[PDB]
Amino acid sequence: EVLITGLRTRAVNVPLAYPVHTAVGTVGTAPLVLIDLATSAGVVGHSYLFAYTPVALKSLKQLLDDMAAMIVNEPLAPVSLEAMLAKRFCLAGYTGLIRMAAAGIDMAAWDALGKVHETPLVKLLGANARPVQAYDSHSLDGVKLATERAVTAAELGFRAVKTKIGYPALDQDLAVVRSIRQAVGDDFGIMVDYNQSLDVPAAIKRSQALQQEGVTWIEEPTLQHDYEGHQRIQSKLNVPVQMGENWLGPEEMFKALSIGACRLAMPDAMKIGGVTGWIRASALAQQFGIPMSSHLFQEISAHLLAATPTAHWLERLDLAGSVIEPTLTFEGGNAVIPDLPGVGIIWREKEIGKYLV
Amino acid sequence: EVLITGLRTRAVNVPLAYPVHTAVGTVGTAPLVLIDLATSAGVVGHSYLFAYTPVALKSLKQLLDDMAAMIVNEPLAPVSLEAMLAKRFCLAGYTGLIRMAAAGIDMAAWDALGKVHETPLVKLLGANARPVQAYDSHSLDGVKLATERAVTAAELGFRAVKTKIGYPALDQDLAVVRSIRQAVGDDFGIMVDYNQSLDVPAAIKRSQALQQEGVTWIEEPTLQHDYEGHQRIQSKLNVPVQMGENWLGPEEMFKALSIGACRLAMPDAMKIGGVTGWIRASALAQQFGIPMSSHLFQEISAHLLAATPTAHWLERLDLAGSVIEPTLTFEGGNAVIPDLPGVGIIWREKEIGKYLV
Amino acid sequence: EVLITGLRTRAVNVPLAYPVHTAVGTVGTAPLVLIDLATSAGVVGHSYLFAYTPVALKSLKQLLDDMAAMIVNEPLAPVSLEAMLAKRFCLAGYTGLIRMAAAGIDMAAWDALGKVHETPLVKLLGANARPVQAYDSHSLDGVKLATERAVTAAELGFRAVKTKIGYPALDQDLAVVRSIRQAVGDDFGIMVDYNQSLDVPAAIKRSQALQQEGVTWIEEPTLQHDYEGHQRIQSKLNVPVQMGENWLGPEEMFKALSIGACRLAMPDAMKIGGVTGWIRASALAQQFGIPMSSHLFQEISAHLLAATPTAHWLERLDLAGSVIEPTLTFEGGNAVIPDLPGVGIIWREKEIGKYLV
Amino acid sequence: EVLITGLRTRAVNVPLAYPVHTAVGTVGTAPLVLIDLATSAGVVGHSYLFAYTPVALKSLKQLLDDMAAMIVNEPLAPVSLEAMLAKRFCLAGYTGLIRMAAAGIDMAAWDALGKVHETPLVKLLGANARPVQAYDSHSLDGVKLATERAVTAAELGFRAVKTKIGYPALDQDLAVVRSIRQAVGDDFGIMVDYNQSLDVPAAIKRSQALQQEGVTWIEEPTLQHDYEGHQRIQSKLNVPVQMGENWLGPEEMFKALSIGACRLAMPDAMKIGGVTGWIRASALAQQFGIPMSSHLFQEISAHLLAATPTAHWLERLDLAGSVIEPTLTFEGGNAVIPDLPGVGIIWREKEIGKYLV
Amino acid sequence: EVLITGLRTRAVNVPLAYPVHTAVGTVGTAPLVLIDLATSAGVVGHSYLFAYTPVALKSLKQLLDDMAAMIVNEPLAPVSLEAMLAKRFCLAGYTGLIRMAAAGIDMAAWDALGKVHETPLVKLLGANARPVQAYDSHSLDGVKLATERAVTAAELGFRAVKTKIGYPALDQDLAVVRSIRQAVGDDFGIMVDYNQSLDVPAAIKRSQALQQEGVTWIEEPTLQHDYEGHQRIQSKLNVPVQMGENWLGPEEMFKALSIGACRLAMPDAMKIGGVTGWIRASALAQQFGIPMSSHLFQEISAHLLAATPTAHWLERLDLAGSVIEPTLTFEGGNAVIPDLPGVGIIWREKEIGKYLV
Numbered sequence A, B, C, D, E: 001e002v003l004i005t006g007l008r009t010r011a012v013n014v015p016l017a018y019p020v021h022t023a024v025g026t027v028g029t030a031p032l033v034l035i036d037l038a039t040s041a042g043v044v045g046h047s048y049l050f051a052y053t054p055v056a057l058k059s060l061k062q063l064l065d066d067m068a069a070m071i072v073n074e075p076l077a078p079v080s081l082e083a084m085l086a087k088r089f090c091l092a093g094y095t096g097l098i099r100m101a102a103a104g105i106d107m108a109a110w111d112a113l114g115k116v117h118e119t120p121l122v123k124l125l126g127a128n129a130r131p132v133q134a135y136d137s138h139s140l141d142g143v144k145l146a147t148e149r150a151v152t153a154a155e156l157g158f159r160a161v162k163t164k165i166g167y168p169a170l171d172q173d174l175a176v177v178r179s180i181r182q183a184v185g186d187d188f189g190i191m192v193d194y195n196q197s198l199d200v201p202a203a204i205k206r207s208q209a210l211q212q213e214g215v216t217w218i219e220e221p222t223l224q225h226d227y228e229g230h231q232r233i234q235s236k237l238n239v240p241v242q243m244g245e246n247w248l249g250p251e252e253m254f255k256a257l258s259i260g261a262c263r264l265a266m267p268d269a270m271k272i273g274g275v276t277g278w279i280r281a282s283a284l285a286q287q288f289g290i291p292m293s294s295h296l297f298q299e300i301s302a303h304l305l306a307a308t309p310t311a312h313w314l315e316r317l318d319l320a321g322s323v324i325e326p327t328l329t330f331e332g333g334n335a336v337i338p339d340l341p342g343v344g345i346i347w348r349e350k351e352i353g354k355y356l357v
C-alpha cells in the first residue's frame, strides 16, 4: 500500500498581468496555496488552491496544515480519502474553506497517483488525451482594453473569449460587446459574465438585450446560490445561462440542475471537490444533458475535460503561470495536455520566493 | 456616529464535563473563538464561535483576524455590516467558515448595539423578555449515563432532554430511549438526534421504531445537506423530523423548507448568520408554519427565541460555561434572560487564561 | 419596563394638490387617522393610517379607540404587542380594518421606541441611513397634465415617475405613455399602474403593447387578491409585474410569491403590518429574489427601505404633507432620512384643525 | 322598479346562557349589529352581523351606517349591489370588516327580495324547503359541562354535537371526547374544534389521537389563513379536516380548496359574502367534492343549505335567539324552515331594548 | 307549493337565412325541441333544445316525453328538480342527450318560476337588467359573403362578428380575415372559430399566423374534449383560446379550467345544464378569472349574462327566430332584455306548423 507521508503548503500572492475586474470587485493579484503531498513511494503530488481574496489566504493555509495529521499515514487512495474527510467534517460543515482544502488534497493525491503509475492523469482516468477547445478569459476591462485583449486572443488562434460585464449601465455592457464583435467578426464566441451582480428582473432585461447582440452564454447573472432565480432568468432566454464555478461539491450542482437553473455548467476543479468531485459532476452533466466546461485550474482541467462525456470549453485564465512551468500549451486555441505523469504541474521554485506571504 | 474601533479574538479549547459523543464522532472539548468588538462608544461587544473540532480552530481565528480590516472604522450597524460582508465574500463563497466568522461579528455587533442603548438585546429587537422552555441536551452516552443525566435534568426542573443516538444496532437506540422514559415518566420530552448517520431507508426504519416508542422529534436523520432525503424520511413519519443546525444562512433554510424537508427547525445562531440571519430565519419559519428552536449559543438564543414568532425550545448545552459568567439562569426548566445590556455575556477572564491555545 | 399609557386618534380628511384618479375611481382627498401613542417614559409615538375612502374613516378611528384598553399598560415592545393583537383578533379575523389598525399601533410603537433610545428608526433596526431612490407618483391624469407632472418631477431631479392607467381604450394608455416619454427622454423610468382594472386577457394584451413602449413595470394589472391571475399575466411578459400594496400581512405576500404572481413587490407599510410586518416582508423578498419597493407612507418607508436587503424604490406620494412637518427631503431624486429620533414625524398641529372630521 | 330606501342598524350585546369558550379566548356575549333595509315596496329586509368581540362592535355599526350612502336609492338586486360594493371597496380592501358589512346588506337584501315575492328565501333560490340535519354546537366547557350539554342535545333529538377543544394537555381533549362518547353512544357525531390553537406538528399529534378515539371532524386545527398548513395536517389524517368559517369571500375558499387544505367546508353566511357569496361557495364545494356545512347564522343557513348541492350539517348555535322570534324549529335534530317570506326573521322588539349599547 | 303538471314537446326543423357552415360539416337548418312546462299556478314555462343534426332530433324529443312522468307532480323548484334528475340518471350517464334534456326542463322551469313571480328571469336571479354587448355570429362563408355579412353587421351597429374558419389552406383563413378587416376597420372585433378541425400542431401554426393578423379570439382550435391539447395550443399564444360550447355540465368546465385549457369561456345554456348549471358555471369563471360569454340561446343568455360576474360577450345567432317572437332586441350592438316575466320567450304558434317534424 502506497501511503501519504506528509503535507506541505505555501501561501503566495502572485501578480496578474491583467487584474481580474468584476462588477462586484477586483482580484488584482492571485492568492494561492501551493500543496505538496509526499508519499512513501517517493513521489510528490502537487496542486494548488485559489483563495480569491488575501483575506482568506492565511486561514486556508492554516486549515490545510492542521489537516496534515488526519491524512498522514493514510493510503494514497483519493476516493477513500475523500470519504474519510467528508465524515471527519460531518459536524463542522463540509463546505466552503474546509471543502476547498479537502479538494486541494484530492488534486495533489490524484497527481501523486498518476506519478506512482507514471501515467498522465487523463489516462489514469481511462480516457485518451485530446486537444480541448479553450476560450481566453478577460475581465471588466472597458471598451478599449476589452477590444485589444480580444484581438490579441484571436491573433493567438483562440476561437472565443469571455469578458466580464455588469457596468453601471446596460448601454456600457452592449458597447463593450459590440466593440469586441466588430473586431473579431461573426465567427467567434463572446461569452459574458455578470458575476452575480444583477437581481432577477435586471438580469432578464440585460440578458434579453445581450441575446439580441449574439453572445455565446450569459454567466452567473444573479446571486450564485439562487438556483430558483437562475431558473427564472433562464426561462426568459434562448441563449444559455451558464454557472457552476461556485458549486461547492457535486451536491450543489445536483440541486441547481434538478430545478433547471441553467443550460450549461462549468464546475471549478477546486470547489467541485477536486478530481473526485469532478468525475461525479461529469456523471451528473451527462444525465442532465448539460455541456460541461471548466472554471480556472486550467492545468488539471485539460485532463479532466478529456474524461468528461459532455466536455464543452476549457477556460483559459492562467492564475498560477508565475509559479508553474508552462507545460500546458495552446495550439490553434486548444489546450494540449503535456506528456508528463499525473497533472504535469512543475513548480518554478526559483520564482515562488518572490511571492511568499 | 458609533464606529467599530477594534476586533480581538481568543482561541480556547475548553474540556467538557461530558464530551459530546455522536454517531459520527466525539467532540471532547469545545474549541471556541472568543470575540471582542471595541466601539467608539467605549462599550465592547462580546460573542463567540464554536469550531466543532480543534482542526478548524486556528484557521477560524486567523480568518476573523484578517476580516478585522474590513470592519474596523465601519459604523456599528449590524445589518449594513452584514450586507457589506456578503458583498466582500461574493466571489470567494459566503458560506462555511467565512459565513461563521461573519456571524460572530454580527452577534458581537448586536451585543455592542444593545450596550450603546443600555438595553437587553431582546428589547432592542422589540420584544419582551419571557421565560423560554429549555431541554437539557446530552449525547451518545450509553444506556447508563444517558439515564443518569436524564434523572439529573428532571430534578433540575427541565421538562425535556435530548439524547444522541445512532448506535450500531437499532435495538440499542431503542434501549436508551426506553431507559430514559422509565426514569422521567410519560409527561416529559425525549428528543433524539442521529447526527446525519443514516441513509434514507435505515432512517425510515429506525425512525418508525422510535416513533412507536414515543419520542419528541427525530433530528438530522441523514446527511445534513440532503433536503430531498429528509423530505422522503419525513414523508414516512408522524413524528416530526427536526433539522437546521447546519443551515449556513437563511437562504439554506429557505431551500430546505421549500421542499418540505422537515416539520421543525432549529437554526444555530452562528451558522444562520448571527442575530441578523436569525431574525430572517424566524420570518421564514413563521410563514412556512414551522416551530423554531435554537441550537447551542444558549446565551444569545434566549434573547432571540423571545423575539421568534414560532419559538419552540431553547437547547441547553453549556459549551461556553467555563468562560462566561452564569448570568443566564433556569427556573422550572425555563431560560431566564438576565437584566443586562446586550446579550448579558461577561467573560470569566481568570478562567480564559487556562484554556488559551 | 417602558409602558404604553394611552392612545389618541384624530380623523382628518386632507386636501390633495392633485386628486388621485385611478381607473376604478378617484381619491380626491386623503382620509387619515393620526395616531399618538403615549408612554411612561414621557415620549409620544406618532403614525397614521390611510383609510382610502371617507366611508371607512370613522369606522377605523372608532376601532382604534376601542383598542386603546387592550394596549394601555402593555410594555412598549412592538413585536410582543403584535403577537398579542394577532391572538386577540384570532376569532374575528386579523385582516382588513383590524389589521390596519394593529399596523397603526405598531408604527407609533416603533416611533416611540426610537424616541426612548433617541435614535432614528433606521438605526434602531441595525442599519445605516442612506439616500433611497424615489419615483414621483402621479395618477390617471390625461395626456396634458400627465406630461406636465412628469416634466416638473424631472425638473426636481426625480429619475422616474409613475402614472396610473386603464383609460377606456388601450390607445389612450399608449398616448399618455408616449407623451411622457417624448418629454423626459429615454433615460427615465415610467412605471404604470392599472389599479386592478383589467381581466387577465385584457391585461396580457395591454401589457404586451406597453412593454413594446418601454415601461419600467406594470402594477396591479388585475384583481389584487388574484395571485394565480397575476402569475398568468406575468408568464406572458418580460417587463416585471409589480404588486403588493394590497397584501394584508406578510402571509399574503408569502402566498403571492409562492405561486410566482409577480417579479417585483411593493408592500404598504400599513397593510403589511407596520414596521414589524415590513421587516418580515423584507426577509421574504430577499429569499424569493424580489426587489422590494414601498407604497405610500413615504416618511416611515425611507427608514424601512434602508433596512431592506432588496430595497428597490421609494414611492413619493405625499398624502400627509398637510399635517406633517417636511423633515423628509429629496436630493437628486433620493429620499433623505432626517436626523430625528424614531420616524421623524412631527405634527403640524396648527393645521390639523382645518381638516378634522 | 324596487329600490332601497333606508338602512338602519342597531348594536346589541346579548349575554349568552353558555359563553362560547375557545382555546384562544372566550366570547361571553354576542355583539351583533341588527340590520333593517327599508324598500320602496314597503317590506323591510332583516339580517344581522356577529362582531365576535365588543371591541369591533361600534366600529362595525359605524361602518355600515357610512355604507348606507352607497346603497340607498339603488335597486334591490343583491347580485348587482354586491358587484357595486366590490368596486367601491376595490382600493381600500374588500375584505374583513368591510366585506362583513357588505354581507349583512346582502343578507337583508335577499330577505327583502323574498318579501317582495312573498316567498321563503329557499324557494326564491329555486329549491324546496326540506329538513336539514343539525349539530348542537357547544364550547370549551370542561368535562362536566360538555357531557351535560351533550346529554341535553341528545334528549332534544340532535344526532351530533360539537365541542371546542385545545386544553393545555392532549389528555384533557381526549377525556372530554371520551366522556361525551360514553354519554351519547357510538351512533352519534362528535365534532371537535381547535379554534386555530395548534401549530402543524401538535395538530398532527393531537389529531391522530383524536382520530383513534372516533370523532366526526377536526375543525381549524391551525391558524385559519394557513391553507398549506391545513393541507399538511390533512395529509396525515383519515378523519376529515374541517374549516371555512373564516373565509372572507368565496375567493378565499377557492384558494384553500385549490391546494387541498381540507376535506369538509363550513362557510359562514356573513364572512362568505351573504347569500350571494354562499351560492358561489356552494358551486365551488360541489366541483371540488366537498360536503359543505354552515357556521352560525342558523336562521338564514337553513334556507341556504337546502339550496346547497353538497349540503352536510347546519350548525346550531343560537347567537341571536334573544332578539329573533323562534320561527326556525328542530324536529328529530333537523332544522325546519318556517313558511314565512324571505328568511323568516322577526325581531323581538321588546327584547332588543334591553341589549342596546 | 307550485307543482309541475305536464310536459309537452314539439320537434321542428327550421330554415336558416344563412346555413351554418363549419370546417367539420354544415348545419343548414335548425333541429329544435320546443318545450312547454305546465304548472298548477296556471303558467307555462317555455324553453327549447338545439339537436345540431336531424339525426338526433326525434331521439331527443322521445327522451323528454319519456321523462314527463318523473317530473309531473314535482315542485317547480328547478334546483331540487336538477338534483333529482342527476340522481335518476346516475347509472345511465348524466351527460349528452340526457343532460341536454334535463337542461331543457331546467330552462322551462326557471321561465315558469319568473312567470309565477311576474318578474324577468334576470331579476329573479337578483341582478339588474343591463344591455349586453353582442357579436354577430357568421359561418364558414367564403371571402365574398363573409365580408358582406361583416359590413351588414357593422351597419346594424355590432362592434364585432365571428367567422368560422378551417378552410383547406391557412392562406384561405387569412384572406377571409384580411378581407373582413379591410371592410370593418381596426376598431372592430373579429372572433374566429375552428370548430375542432385542427390537430395540436396545425392549431399552433394557424393560430400564430392568425394572431399576427389581429383576431379577438381563437375558438375550439382542436377536439373539444381535449383540454390538455387546448392547453398546449394556448401555451403558444398571446391571443386567448376560447371554448366551452361543448362542456356538458359545469363539471366539464371545471376540468378544462383546472388544467388551463383556455383563457376565455363560453358555456352553452343547454349543454352547461340550463340556468342552474349556468349559475354554477359563472361561479367557476369568476374564481378562475375567466371572462365568460354565451353560446347560442341568445334569448335566455341575455338574462344569464347580466347575472354573470365576468360576463364578456353575447353570441348573436338567432336559431329560433322563426318560431319565437322577437322581444329580444339589439341597440347599438347590445342585447336588450325585454320587460316580460321569466325569459320573454313567446311562441309564434302560427309559424310552428310549417316546420313540424
Ligand SMILES: O=NN(O)c1ccccc1
Pocket (backbone or CB within 6 Å): A020, A022, A027, A193, A195, A245, A295, A296, B091
Ligand atoms: O469566470 N470566472 N470568474 O467569475 C472569476 C475568476 C477569477 C476571479 C474572480 C472571478
Ligand SMILES: O=NN(O)c1ccccc1
Pocket (backbone or CB within 6 Å): A091, B020, B022, B027, B193, B195, B245, B295
Ligand atoms: O444538536 N446538537 N448537535 O447535533 C451537536 C452539538 C455539539 C457538537 C456537535 C453536534
Ligand SMILES: O=NN(O)c1ccccc1
Pocket (backbone or CB within 6 Å): C020, C022, C027, C193, C195, C245, C295, C296, D091
Ligand atoms: O400605487 N398606489 N396606488 O395604487 C394608490 C395610492 C393611493 C390611493 C389610491 C391608489
Ligand SMILES: O=NN(O)c1ccccc1
Pocket (backbone or CB within 6 Å): C091, D020, D022, D027, D193, D195, D245, D295
Ligand atoms: O365554529 N364556531 N366557532 O369556531 C366559533 C363560534 C363562536 C365564536 C367564535 C368561534
Ligand SMILES: O=NN(O)c1ccccc1
Pocket (backbone or CB within 6 Å): E020, E022, E027, E193, E195, E245, E295, E296
Ligand atoms: O360557435 N358556435 N358553433 O361553433 C356552432 C353553432 C351552431 C351550429 C354549429 C356550431
Ligand SMILES: [Mg+2]
Pocket (backbone or CB within 6 Å): A193, A195, A219, A220, A245
Ligand atoms: Mg465567472
Ligand SMILES: [Mg+2]
Pocket (backbone or CB within 6 Å): B193, B195, B219, B220, B245
Ligand atoms: Mg444536532
Ligand SMILES: [Mg+2]
Pocket (backbone or CB within 6 Å): C193, C195, C219, C220, C245
Ligand atoms: Mg398602485
Ligand SMILES: [Mg+2]
Pocket (backbone or CB within 6 Å): D193, D195, D219, D220, D245
Ligand atoms: Mg369553529
Ligand SMILES: [Mg+2]
Pocket (backbone or CB within 6 Å): E193, E195, E219, E220, E245
Ligand atoms: Mg363555436
